[PDB]
Amino acid sequence: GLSDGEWQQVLNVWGKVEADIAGHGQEVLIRLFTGHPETLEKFDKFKHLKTEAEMKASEDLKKHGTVVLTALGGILKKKGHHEAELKPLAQSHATKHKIPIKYLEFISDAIIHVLHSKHPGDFGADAQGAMTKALELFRNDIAAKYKELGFQ
Ligand code: HEM
């Protein structure tokens, strides 16, 4: 449950991401994969990436980063009214990709890390609070769908 002012902060922060969705998406995934190498194993199409240099050079990783952040941005712009947008992602990530909710926590924190890394001094405490709450809401609603599906 975010206030109007918190959603305003979220969407203000998101404008930073939308200016360079592929660069943000790439860095989010690289942060996820390098911080939590087990997550790489969930991607048949990225498990060949042995080094961060290879990850950085991967155009397909940037492409997927764009897909991920485009989806997330579409969800965030719903300001919590995202059941229709979230449902297929929860279902695909539980049933097809088999992504534990822990990895969604990892990527949520990776987003925060990337925002500070790319916008140092420009991702204020209020913005971090609002973005964190929005990612918690996202993760929590996914978690509810995971529970429905019995997925761990
Ligand atoms: C912000 C959180 C995430 C968003 C918005 C997101 C979004 C997406 C989207 C839109 C797709 C393609 C459509 C689909 O298959 O449903 C996808 C595919 C996929 N996602 Fe995610 N995802 C997120 C987090 C994760 C995490 C944390 C993992 C694993 C650690 C993961 C693993 C995968 C895999 C393996 C695929 C299939 C990739 C392929 O083979 O093309 N996702 N994701």
Q: Where are the domains of the chain?
A: 1-152
Which atom number of ligand 1 is nearest to the Cα of residue 40? Answer: 30
Residues with C-beta less than 6 Å from any ligand 1 atom: 39, 42-45, 67-68, 71-72, 89, 92-93, 97, 99, 103-104, 107
Burial class of residue 1, CB neighbours in 10 A (0-12, 13-18, 19+): exposed
Experimental method: X-ray
Q: Are 106 and 32 in contact (CB under 8 A)?
A: yes
Phi, psi of 144, rounded to the nearest 5 degrees: -65, -40
Candidates 1.10.760.10, 2.40.110.20, 1.10.490.10, 2.60.40.420; CATH matching 1-152: 1.10.490.10
Query: How would DSSP label each residue in 99-119?
Result: --HHHHHHHHHHHHHHHHHHS
What is the longest distance spanned by two Cα atoms in the chain? 43
